[PDB]
Design a binder for this molecule. Structure first.
Ligand SMILES: Nc1nc2c(ncn2[C@@H]2O[C@H](COP(=O)(O)OP(=O)(O)O)[C@@H](O)[C@H]2O)c(=O)[nH]1
Ligand SMILES: Nc1nc2c(ncn2[C@@H]2O[C@H](COP(=O)(O)OP(=O)(O)O)[C@@H](O)[C@H]2O)c(=O)[nH]1
Ligand SMILES: [Mg+2]
Ligand SMILES: [Mg+2]
Lengths: 257, 257
């Protein structure tokens, strides 16, 4: 119900793009949208939430571990309401943190997931079963259908690849390596439209470079914030159904042994 | 037996410091030194090896996983011989890679570990049992005594801490968080001299800033290369014994159930 005043922190050019995207939503009778942010710990999930809202609404720690309770931030602008749910990492010690996973499930009880934002770091060089277990955990808790509404977001995008490797090439290799394990973890068929998960780049840093319109751009010259909301809008408006979470859904999914 | 020509890649000021340290070693009748580089995958172990040797002697991949075979690089200068053993990460999928761990053990068979270089990234924000299992694995394979010869090295030191947090403060928090799990994994007593593990900073990047002497310095104004070799020299010259690895050692350690 609180005004999305945080938009006033974005460069004017970006604000106009975002307001236009919210317009397209209300145009399609989409008056609100719930985005669920999930992934491992320390990848910049809550920092992404602050960047999107435009204010320090959630806690971020470069040392201490995340809190256990999920948090939903809600703001409104021009009749549209954005709801974003920040959550604690799902992995710890090498296994799926069942306490964090279930507390998230309880929090989503009676809520509708319109967009799944899977977060990880761009500047990472390895991928293993740990990433696969996160994707699997998500599927087991909400159904493979959630992937039709998924977007993978890579943080720390203001990166300079080592060995003078082209930014575009590093991004390509990194994305492919991560989509592979995610697709495997979620048991998604390579041909299914659901495996076709979009990847976006994110730089939450305040030192992020900017274009002549004062917009935060990436090394590839793209204003990541407008692009992010654009992707979110397109995924939300796709023909797939949002995921309504209720006990029935949770039970029917737990039934699968 | 090959000349350490790679020293010619270091700034003159650094070369003189390093040559002086090698002199102190031969002064103490220490004609050779074997450094064992270990840690998780993708933290910059082999990149550290190239920086120390001063040439692309080992493989580095920002995507593909490390090779399975350990590699020892040997170079000589002024009668001193440096032997450095690069190894594959010990963790994978959340568990200790028993194949990589044992292949390393076979490689060290009949070798003497003078310095243990435990490698990890500076720019990481979480620490869990995974880091503890690596430290434990090391202890279980060679004995808690190896820690008397250990040094923890944090890569990506050319880092700008988020939230405008002081570099020195980030380094402090990060080191303490990592030493904690390592000390726990190795079952080291907080008062024992063995728990007093030194931490050094490393920036393998070619974009690393430099001082007026052309030396690669860190955000704290320290030439990390000379400092690194200095620490290695001091640890090697401490009163503790190096670890001679033989079947007997391996067996006696495996005996402990
Ligand atoms: N440079 C950079 N730092 C970031 C980025 N995202 C997150 N951070 C830092 O990464 C740390 C962890 O962020 P946080 O949002 O708490 O991660 P989480 O635990 O997954 O929610 C914090 O110190 C953030 O300042 C990013 O995109 N770039
Ligand atoms: N900026 C930066 N990149 C580094 C640093 N050390 C390693 N790298 C990069 O990190 C990746 C992994 O390095 P590598 O030595 O192969 O790690 P390992 O698998 O643990 O041996 C490579 O792309 C290196 O270029 C470092 O200190 N700073
Ligand atoms: Mg968080
Ligand atoms: Mg390596």
């Amino acid at each position: 119900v609180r005004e999305w005043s945080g938009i006033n922190t974005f460069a004017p050019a970006t604000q106009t793009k975002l307001l236009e995207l919210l317009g397209n939503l209300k145009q399609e009778d989409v008056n609100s949208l719930t985005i669920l942010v999930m992934g491992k710990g320390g990848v910049g999930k809550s920092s992404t939430v602050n960047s999107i809202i435009g204010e320090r609404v959630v806690s971020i720690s470069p040392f201490q571990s995340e809190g256990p309770r999920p948090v939903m931030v809600s703001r409104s602008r021009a009749g549209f309401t954005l709801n974003i749910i920040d959550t604690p990492g799902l992995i710890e010690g090498g296994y799926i943190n069942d306490m964090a996973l279930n507390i998230i499930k309880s929090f989503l009880l009676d809520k509708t997931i319109d967009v799944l934002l899977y977060v990880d770091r761009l500047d990472a060089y390895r991928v293993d079963n740990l990433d696969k277990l996160v994707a699997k955990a998500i599927t087991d808790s909400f159904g493979k259908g959630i992937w039709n509404k998924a977007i993978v977001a890579l943080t720390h995008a203001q990166f300079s690849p080592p060995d003078g490797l082209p930014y575009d090439e590093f991004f390509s290799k990194r994305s492919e390596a991560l989509l592979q394990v995610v697709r495997s973890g979620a048991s998604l068929k390579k041909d299914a439209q659901a495996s076709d998960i979009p990847v976006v780049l994110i730089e939450n840093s305040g030192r992020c470079n900017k274009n002549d319109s004062d917009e935060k751009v990436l090394p590839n010259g793209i204003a990541w914030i407008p692009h992010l909301v654009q992707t979110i809008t397109e995924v939300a408006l796709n023909k797939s159904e949002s995921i309504f979470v209720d006990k029935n859904l949770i039970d029917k999914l737990a039934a699968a042994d």
